[PDB]
Design a protein around this nucleic acid. Sequence first.
RNA 1: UUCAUCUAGACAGCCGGACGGUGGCCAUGGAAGUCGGAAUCCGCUAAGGAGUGUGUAACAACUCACCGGCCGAAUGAACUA
Lengths: 191, 189, 68, 172, 52, 94
Amino acid sequence: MKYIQTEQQIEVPEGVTVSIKSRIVKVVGPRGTLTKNLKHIDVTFTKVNNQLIKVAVHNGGRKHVAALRTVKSLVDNMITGVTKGYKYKMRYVYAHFPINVNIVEKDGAKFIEVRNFLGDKKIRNVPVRDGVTIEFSTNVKDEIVLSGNSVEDVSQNAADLQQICRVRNKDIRKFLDGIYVSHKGFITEDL
Amino acid sequence: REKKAEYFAKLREYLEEYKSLFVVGVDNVSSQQMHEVRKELRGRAVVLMGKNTMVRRAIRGFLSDLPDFEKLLPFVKGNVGFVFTNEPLTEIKNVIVSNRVAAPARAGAVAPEDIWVRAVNTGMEPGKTSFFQALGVPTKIARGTIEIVSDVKVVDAGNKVGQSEASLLNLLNISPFTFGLTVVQVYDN
Amino acid sequence: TDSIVKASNWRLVEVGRVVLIKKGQSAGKLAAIVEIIDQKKVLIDGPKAGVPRQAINLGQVVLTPLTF
Amino acid sequence: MAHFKEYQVIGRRLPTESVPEPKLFRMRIFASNEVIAKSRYWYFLQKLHKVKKASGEIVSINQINEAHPTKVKNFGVWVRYDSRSGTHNMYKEIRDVSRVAAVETLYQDMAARHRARFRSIHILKVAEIEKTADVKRQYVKQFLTKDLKFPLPHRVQKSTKTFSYKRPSTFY
Amino acid sequence: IIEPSLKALASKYNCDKSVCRKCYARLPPRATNCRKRKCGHTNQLRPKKKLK
Amino acid sequence: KGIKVTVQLKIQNRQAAASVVPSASSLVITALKEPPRDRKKDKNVKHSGNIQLDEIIEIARQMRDKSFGRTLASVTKEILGTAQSVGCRVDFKN
RNA sequence: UUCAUCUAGACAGCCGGACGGUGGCCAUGGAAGUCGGAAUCCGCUAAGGAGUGUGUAACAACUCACCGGCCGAAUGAACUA
Ligand SMILES: [Zn+2]
């Protein structure tokens, strides 16, 4: 209709301490900082009282009042992604071939490489970047478990593993094995 | 406001007609029991598991049609059962403690807790013996029928129970998870 | 909890904004917006400056942060 | 045609003295001037009862001026037009200040969101909604609230000289 | 073999999805339209032919 | 009744074969009905009949697997008459 | 454009009940909540179909209409250009 004015009410917990300018957002809290390049949403911000952040749009369309919700769903992740943090779990499924993975430091890169997928001889290699840390999880049943602070860092490479370990040239709904995500959790819930 | 004209005559015509209110409730119930414990109270005791009325707690609890009724304002927590009892205080506390657990699950109810196995033979016919590739119980079989050797555990906590985990337990005559009755509150006129 | 937010100042049109007629026949007079009719058209009342009581557009007018 | 005027108009259906003194019908229509105010008057009544120009006349013609041309108010409006395929009857809610300023938009409006041109529309009855909360289209209701008043971004300024040395900002 | 509480966890990414009857794209398990523009957001959605 | 869609139970405990009759729906009708049962309607569909039999409605709890406990004789009126159109025996309540 | 709802809590979402007669009459190789015809009923009521969706040996299994508790304001069903 080209609505005149809406808003949302982004909360800022006491552990995190936001610092924004024109359209660039720098969040920082108990476990380091994240910075989010946000130069294509065309929304403004006004402090009200030390924990509540106003977002605004004026004379939008339909999509420019939809993206005004999209900017909300980015920032509230960031206060969660610094205070609460993330932790993924990522379960093996394998039959007749063990899926043994191991980590390599190949000239500053830190690849994680996967061997013996579906009885191949070929060696996989998957890079990671800063802001993530894998851990081959034991005392529990045979998972890779990683963590981090963003959501562009934890999910992107880990689902790319789930993009790597899909079978090709066979059918799909009968060769079920591979690596698949089980639960998207936080490193410190329930406090 | 799905069904307000067929059941708001039934919100009126016998909510005035009863003098003491004993509240109970089950959020998530069975059905062998809800053709039992709703149907067995027939003749004067409709157990009222109706809906929330939270605008008409101000026309029901302000005009004072009944003098000692205005108490049920914060008590719409959980699916409320408020059986109408103009009966004395002798046959009350012993009938509302009927059972805790009931007949076993519908093959995949939520049960993320732990379970124990005793070394007592049950009488399982040779069926599912080639289907124990989830735990692998060392089992002796005495000429066709199984026999439990020793006491071993099954699984720890933090999982989900579906078909291949409940159906061994559904064939075992043990079910301490049926999520039965509660006991809440009693008050007179 | 220092949580610096930029400034993002504006000029927002409450009843009591004195404006400046850039084109028209007032051509630089001082009105006062009174009854906001729609998003682009705007009523004006500056009657001792020599203006009518009309509902001008928004592209025809500019304004000032001075506000009563 | 142009930024319209607004009229009353009254016709008579010429008295044959066999059955004299007819009934003096009345419209209240919209037009750009008086000659098309006359030449749309027969068009409303040719589709009503068997009159044409060689049966009747205009006995007077008056440019109605509007009572309060400065007060704001909500106009309710019923509109019949012809589409590419099928005719319809509508209900918009225009927001304006006077009656011919009200339907000045609506000829220009429904030429956009439907491409119904001027010769294929019959603006039938233009009422007014004088009190709040029963404007049915709520997109003009949300205007009618308490101290709603808003900023207005991206102020371009004008250009007279073809060059500039300043590289302007748009603070407003 | 793959035990039946982790054939489920790999079912939710390979088999239990829907498809478009026109362009054979892979679709979510609850939807109304093929998002992919070449069949024009059409409405013909069947389930995926499962095992057996 | 037999291997049609009804129920009879059996219980075995220490040399005791429970050949009891909980006797689901049909045998309440069949013990009332007329002995030529096996013929002339076991080829086509079995909803042909215009017969009215008895007024002995007090057999309505002591025959087959009650779980209602609510009416002295108004159970099998409100079960059947509808559920077999091979005889009427109750002429109004549809 | 209508037709329905609509702070007596709507439409969501989270939690599950979704029966008893009966595992209807037959119809068969047995058809049981989910192959065919016909009866298309009542009880319980919060509410349940003589069953909308998958499963099989008739099975057994999922869960949905119907429901009941939470946040609390609004949402659908066909169309028209
Ligand atoms: Zn498609």
